[PDB]
Amino acid sequence: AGAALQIPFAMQMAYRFNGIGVTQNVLYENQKLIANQFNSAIGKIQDSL
Amino acid sequence: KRVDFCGKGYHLMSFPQSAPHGVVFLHVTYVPAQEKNFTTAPAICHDGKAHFPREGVFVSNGTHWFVTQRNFYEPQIITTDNTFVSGNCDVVIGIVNNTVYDPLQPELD
Ligand SMILES: *[C@@H]1O[C@H](CO)[C@@H](O[C@@H]2O[C@H](CO)[C@@H](O)[C@H](O)[C@H]2NC(C)=O)[C@H](O)[C@H]1NC(C)=O
Ligand SMILES: *[C@@H]1O[C@H](CO)[C@@H](O[C@@H]2O[C@H](CO)[C@@H](O)[C@H](O)[C@H]2NC(C)=O)[C@H](O)[C@H]1NC(C)=O
Ligand SMILES: *[C@@H]1O[C@H](CO)[C@@H](O[C@@H]2O[C@H](CO)[C@@H](O)[C@H](O)[C@H]2NC(C)=O)[C@H](O)[C@H]1NC(C)=O
């Protein structure tokens, strides 16, 4: 929607969680669990493919 | 609300016009420009507790900390009405020390 603007990644997942009704307080308290779950899921999808 | 359905950028309205064998839409779109640089922080620690912004984002030109909306620049002093508290800050990554001003104490005197 114009010119690209730099933004840290964590403060993008915060906005995306805020979008779907889950308040952003959740993300900053459980960041490591989310990272581990995402990495495990991507490994699983690579293995399945 | 679906992006890029009507125009390149945020959408405001459309006007229809006739044509020989078709229709012509004039979309009105809103596009920002003249950007800047800033240093951010996800939360503010005060008195051992954490403070997060209600709707906005924390910025700081280098000396003072403000909260501004995402799509435009209009800094405001960090008060206790546009921020909310959630627990104590020892696990968040990116906390920065500061003071959060409140109006009740000055209005009390
Ligand atoms: C960051 O912004 C703040 C808010 O304006 C600046 O603090 C004031 O700046 C004005 C001029 O911009 C001065 O006249 C005031 O004396 C400053 N202090 C106060 C309490 O109002 C601050 O100088 C800015 N910092 C930088 C590096 O630009
Ligand atoms: C932003 O990134 C920098 C480096 O890319 C981080 O600086 C590191 O901080 C840790 C402490 O947690 C040190 O052990 C490292 O040695 C630092 N690296 C360098 C190159 O100085 C910085 O902490 C990051 N900021 C946040 C909020 O995560
Ligand atoms: C923010 O303030 C806290 C509270 O004073 C600082 O944490 C202390 O830092 C000193 C210096 O390293 C330690 O000796 C203390 O043990 C720390 N804890 C306490 C309870 O005093 C902290 O360093 C400050 N800065 C940041 C970036 O958090």
Side-chain angles (χ1 to χ4, degrees), chain A residues 1-6 8 11 15 18 23-25 28-29 31-32, chain B residues 9-10 32 35 37 40 42 52-53 56-57 70 84 86 91-93:
Chain A
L5 316 182
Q6 56 194 359
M11 311 185 38
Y15 287 179
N18 209 321
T23 178
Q24 80 208 29
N25 180 32
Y28 292 128
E29 294 294 328
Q31 185 177 2
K32 306 204 149 69
Chain B
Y10 313 109
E35 297 87 357
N37 264 355
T40 176
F52 294 69
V57 59
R70 285 144 205 188
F84 69 93
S86 301
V91 73
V92 188
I93 311 170

Side-chain angles (χ1 to χ4, degrees), chain A residues 13-27, chain B residues 54-55 70 84:
Chain A
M13 290 306 248
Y15 287 179
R16 279 174 193 271
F17 277 171
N18 209 321
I20 72 181
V22 188
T23 178
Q24 80 208 29
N25 180 32
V26 159
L27 169 74
Chain B
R54 276 205 205 267
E55 291 287 13
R70 285 144 205 188
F84 69 93

